[PDB]
Symmetry: D2
Subunit: 237 residues, 4 copies
């Protein structure tokens, strides 16, 4: 239990908290912090980027309520034409499709707002302003919400370019969850190549990039030359 290992355990928990599924307490904390950063930044394009990012998260939060209400309404129905096991299976499959289609619509609306937030941050041309902690914090939040919205619906290939942009920001590369999700997203791509009998150069590329992020995630949370890091190094070597 070194000063650095205690700092590690606390930091991994703080990083896991950062990547937590959105809820009310987290929404309130995020937007209270972002609105103060907007006041300190006093930049019109940042204000417009924040407004779009907030609308995008609001789309997600509204959809979370829609799904609970829809499931409640479906549970409260009497099913007179459900004598057979296959009928109840079919009905649950139709309900799951309605939920999936509404979540896809909410994700599309949310990504349109995130894309607009990015368009406003692209308008901040001054390199000194782009290096500001306020700028990097909002950019990280937009990308993280974007990655999570795609990941939730199993759009793992779509998360890869966003996660790669995210890890380039400040010290985001030291984030164990960013590496864990990147590793899984590359794994999905490797598996898609193996399943579709795709080209070997792509298989090896995806396998390599999965291993890079799997090794980095292990190193970050367990440390270099620990039983977890040494083990992953041995299988790859």
């Amino acid at each position: 239990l070194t000063e650095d290992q205690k700092k590690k355990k606390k930091e991994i928990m703080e990083q896991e908290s950062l990547w937590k599924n959105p809820d009310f307490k987290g929404y309130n904390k995020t937007f209270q912090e972002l609105h103060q950063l907007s006041k300190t930044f006093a930049n019109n394009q940042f204000r417009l980027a924040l407004s779009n990012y907030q609308s995008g998260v609001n789309t997600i939060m509204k959809n979370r309520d829609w799904v609970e209400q829809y499931r409640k309404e479906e549970a409260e129905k009497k099913r007179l034409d459900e004598k057979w096991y296959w009928q109840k299976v079919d009905r649950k499959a139709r309900e799951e499709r309605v939920v999936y289609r509404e979540k896809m619509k909410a994700k599309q609306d949310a990504l349109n707002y995130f894309s607009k937030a990015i368009n406003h941050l692209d308008e901040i041309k001054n390199p000194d302003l782009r290096e500001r902690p306020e700028f990097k914090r909002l950019l990280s939040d937009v990308y993280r919400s974007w990655i999570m919205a795609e990941y939730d619906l199993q759009n793992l290939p779509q998360t890869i370019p966003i996660l790669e942009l995210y890890i380039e920001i400040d010290d985001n590369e030291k984030e164990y969850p960013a590496h864990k999700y990147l590793a899984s997203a590359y794994s999905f791509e490797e598996n898609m190549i193996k399943k579709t009998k795709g080209p070997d150069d792509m298989l090896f590329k995806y396998r390599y990039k999965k291993n890079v992020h799997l090794l980095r995630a292990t190193e970050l949370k367990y440390g270099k030359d620990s039983p977890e890091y040494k083990h992953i190094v041995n299988v790859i070597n």
Copy 2:
């Protein structure tokens, strides 16, 4: 409200009760009645057929308990690796497959016992004994449980020969549910032909047989020259 129409409404309800999903009260009533009929019949092959039929229904009843217990056990688990919507969908799909596989195993065991019940009734060669009400009652119960087990798992083509044997017994042809299930089973076959671009002679045969049973089911529960019977006749004509 004629003497015959009052007799019709009461009879359709009694027929719907006959085709009800198996529960404890129905099981107890069925086997108490069958065991008394076995005593009156005093025939060793009937006794052995009844024992196999009972074992087959017992398989079904035991499986009903297994499914409720399995669903209860699955609901009582903490899911630490279920952050994403697609993960919960996948997990529910795995649970539904375990349920489907166990129901298929119970159906196979139940049909093996029903087949053995039929083998023992086939050993009763004396034509006077085969015409006995006890014989026809057990034969109807075996076929009805067999049809229902297949129908529950969406094995509608498999129900067709069994339903056709069932309706030949005594006055079973006057049963609205037997015609309703036959009509749906022929409809499934017609739809399979249309979906697989099968031969026209089969399409027309299945369409015709669906219409025969749809018309008969309507005639039986609503009566000839009623607004329901006249309507179905017009669409077919």
Copy 3:
């Protein structure tokens, strides 16, 4: 279907929407509107009252998430010591008490913030500022959230002074839900007097005030000299 009757049906729906249980879409709409009114008002005490009101609603919204998460955690447990019906009853009664105690704690925190919002509005002494639409809108929202928090936990007597202050604001007296909840709250008090064999002057007072608000709620949504209004007048007369 007169111009006024069409205006009535639309208005009752808008009033029912105003008194709807809090959800994310409603929270977002309320605080986006209140924050713009704060900008137009440009008053420091209004800003502080709005901040306290928002913290109070946030307490309620956070508690809604806490309850769903608690119920989920309780459902996901295996109960090895629950062989008997009375054990499952007792366990559900303990879960309901934990929920009730947490909701009472959240209500107490929310009412402390609403009380602080009212303290800041009490600091706005200028009679011209107290007559502003921004002032009356925030005051109505604070009282309505306060009434609803108390009503949710069955604190109906506590809602009476708040509902009476609420109906005095602008045209809030024309609100069918305000009269409906007042009528029920007075009914609870009348029933408490009858149950505790309380004094007749209190029984008659509560009965009268229940009737006043029951009659007003009927008049507002069905109109004067309609089959609903005429009926209530006849029973009271």
Copy 4:
């Protein structure tokens, strides 16, 4: 792991299986065994006692289906008048009371049949016939179902005379669950005395009898001079 300790672990599991909540597989096994014992016994009073015992268990089994169907029907209703937390609490409390009242009715009908089973066994006067394994097996099954029906509804004092009659039969005194339930039932009585400030002679009697059965249950499943038996002896000493 001695020959006796392996015999102990297997036997405690067989005893726990004997006291398991009734389900279809257990019902089928019990009545198939009892009907064969009836054939070997060839006694008319035993046949009538078995018929009453079966009707009593059937009452219980039918009620298990009734409760699941009632809960299903209640879950499938839309509740338009359930805006408030207290309304949903009240509604669930009304549902629990309907379930409790139906279970009490089924228990009363089941105990009337068990009492009739006992009346028929009381008619078997020949001491040689009363010592028969068939007689003792049916008597144990009647008492065990009777105890369990009472225990399920928290009628623990009512179970005490039945458990005391049960443990007198053959080697039923070697049954760990019989002692465990007796200990809990005496504990309930001790707690009722402490709660109602009842007489000390009753408190000490119930405390003593609770300890007798708690010590015996420990001795039976863990063995004499084991860490579990030695411990319970020390607290009592």
